[PDB]
């Protein structure tokens, strides 16, 4: 079990495609699940995601034209109950206490939010929180130095290992953060 976490592509509103090295890494037959925070914002990016894995979950972003996407989603992958939401409904944006408030509502071990366009991955109150950032490194009015980034989760029984992939200049650089369920 390994999950791909990404979102906020904003194609074609703010970008046109993923960076060249991201399209090389993301190829079919290798990832089981994909959880998308939203803002694709069209079928051209949806159909590209459906060919990367069979089970793809997408929530609705603030600029997605498809209403059929739900506002939020709670899905289980192994032992971890995971909640998915774009994060434009979380006021204030990127606020810690407002995110933990939603973790109580969904009753999830891991919560996924994405509006910030800033990668974050950390444990709080013995609960884990992911923000993959903009995989395209799209424009954001509140942050000027966006690093194109996504997240790969390696779930095994009662342990998750999250890999952050970042395009720093031309290179793709990876860091690793691990979380074990209490």
């Amino acid at each position: 079990m390994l999950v791909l976490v990404l979102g906020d592509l904003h194609i074609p509103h703010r970008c046109n495609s993923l960076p060249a090295k991201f399209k090389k890494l993301l190829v079919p037959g290798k990832i089981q699940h994909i959880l998308c925070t939203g803002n694709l914002c069209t079928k051209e990016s949806y159909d590209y995601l459906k060919t990367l894995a069979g089970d793809v979950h997408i929530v609705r972003g603030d600029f997605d034209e498809n209403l059929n996407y739900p506002e939020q989603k709670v899905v289980t992958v192994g032992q971890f109950k995971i909640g998915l939401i774009h994060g434009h409904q979380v006021i204030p944006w990127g606020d810690m206490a407002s995110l933990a408030l939603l973790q109580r509502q969904f009753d999830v071990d891991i919560l996924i939010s994405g509006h910030t366009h800033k990668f974050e991955a950390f444990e709080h109150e013995n609960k884990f929180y992911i923000n993959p950032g903009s995989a395209t490194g799209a424009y954001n009015a509140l942050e000027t130095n966006i690093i194109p980034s996504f997240v790969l989760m390696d779930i095994q029984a009662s342990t998750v290992v999250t890999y952050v992939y970042q395009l720093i200049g031309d290179d793709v650089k990876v860091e690793r953060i691990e979380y074990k369920k209490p």
Binding site: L2, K24, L25, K30, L152, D154, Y163, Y165, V174, R176
Partner: peptide, 6 residues
């Protein structure tokens, strides 16, 4: 060592 790392 990420699982991709191409």
């Amino acid at each position: 060592d990420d699982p991709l790392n191409a």
